[PDB]
Design a protein around this ligand. Structure first.
Ligand SMILES: Cc1cccc(C)c1OCC(=O)N[C@@H](Cc1ccccc1)[C@@H](O)C[C@H](Cc1ccccc1)NC(=O)[C@H](C(C)C)N1CCCNC1=O
Lengths: 99, 99
């Protein structure tokens, strides 16, 4: 699956059992998903900080699938304008930039 | 040239007969650059997704070169803690995402 960017690269991930929309952001380095509940333990983490850091939850080693791409990776949780895949999960599904 | 993402995709471009470094951002619809005179006319444009827009200048059909691919597209110039290469140009040079 190769993906021109003429349209914004939104994909469907399966995560938490449930399925959701997300954006493959090479510009984003960590992965935030709108509010979701996941099991077991986590540790707080700040991100953003242009005008404040938002505080979110850090879950590590989480099962997620992206495009039949079953992967497992660190996944922040809490407020987000929208689900965002970042470089953290992309490397583990093996995404590259290609021209 | 295939750019894994363990790292921020920061490539050098040559816009303006100057040389800049800039980040490869599929998360970004446009290409915004840190002020840099350019000839030509301009339209004002707003960007920024929250607590205000950002006003900045739109130029069109500009010559830039990205990792040695020379190409033509709209580029926005003004206030951004960072150069940003967003999809507009990535299509132009024919970069994709793969996995
Ligand atoms: C949390 C969240 C949920 C949903 C959607 C969005 C847009 C959300 O995140 C906010 C955010 O800054 N997202 C970025 C990626 C992101 C999200 C979470 C963790 C890490 C990164 C990116 O996409 C947009 C954002 C906008 C920007 C903010 C400040 C000044 C100018 C531009 N751009 C930037 O931050 C980039 C950085 C990351 C190299 N940026 C900074 C310097 C100048 N130019 C530039 O392009």
């Amino acid at each position: 699956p190769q993906i021109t960017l003429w349209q914004r690269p939104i994909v469907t991930i399966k995560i938490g059992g449930q399925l959701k929309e997300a954006l493959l952001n090479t510009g984003a380095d960590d992965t935030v998903l709108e509010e979701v509940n996941l099991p077991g333990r986590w540790k707080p983490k700040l991100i953003g900080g242009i005008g404040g850091f938002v505080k979110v939850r850090q879950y590590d080693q989480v099962p997620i699938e992206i495009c039949g791409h079953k992967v497992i990776g660190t996944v922040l949780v809490g407020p987000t304008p929208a689900n965002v895949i970042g470089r953290n999960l992309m490397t583990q599904i093996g995404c590259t930039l290609n021209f």
